[PDB]
Amino acid sequence: KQIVPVKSVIYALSPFQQKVMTGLWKDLPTKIHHKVSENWISATLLLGPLVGTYAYVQNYLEKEKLHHRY
Amino acid sequence: LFARIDAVDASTIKRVANRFIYDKDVAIAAMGPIQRLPDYNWFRRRTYWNRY
């Protein structure tokens, strides 16, 4: 567990010489663009099986209900 | 010059330090194997005491 020095040169600024909470909502539309563009595959994979299974279950339940309802 | 110098007492030193040192912003310039030197927040916090 050692440190590996890199030979960099780092300029830093005081936390009291720069605004804090503006960067949250700065450049918001591009942020939302990224969040949606680079992740729609993941959301599709997470939710698609769930909604598909729910639709299948409801279809089966209703069809059995009608068939057995005399 | 001597009168001005020996007109400085402990209370004057405290007042001047409180004007210049207490909770002010430091500027650090370092080079070499400084991978163990503390970062800016460390010094900026050390510029005051919470005991008093």
Number of inter-chain CB pairs under 8 A, A vs B: 13
Q: Give the closest of A5, A12, A17 to B35, CB-based.
A: A5
What is the rounded CA–CA span in Å between residue B45 and residue A46?
45
Method: cryo-EM
> With an 8 Å Cβ cutoff, are B35 and A15 in contact?
no
Structure tokens at B30: 């370092």
Contact assignment for B44 to A14 by CB distance below 8 Å:
yes
For an interface test with A, which of B24, B28, B40 has the most A Cβ atoms less than 10 Å from its Cβ? B40
> What CA–CA distance (Å, rounded) separates A1 from A4?
10
Listed in sequence order, the residues at least 6 apart from B37 whose beta carbon sits closer than 8 Å to its beta carbon are: B30
Stated resolution in angstroms: 3.8
How far is the C-alpha of A36 from the C-alpha of A40, rounded, in Å?
6
What is the rounded CA–CA span in Å between residue A49 and residue A2?
Answer: 46
Torsion of CA A20, A21, A25, A31, to 10 degrees: 60
Is A17's Cβ below 8 Å from some Cβ in B? yes
Residues of A in contact with B41 (CB under 8 A): 15
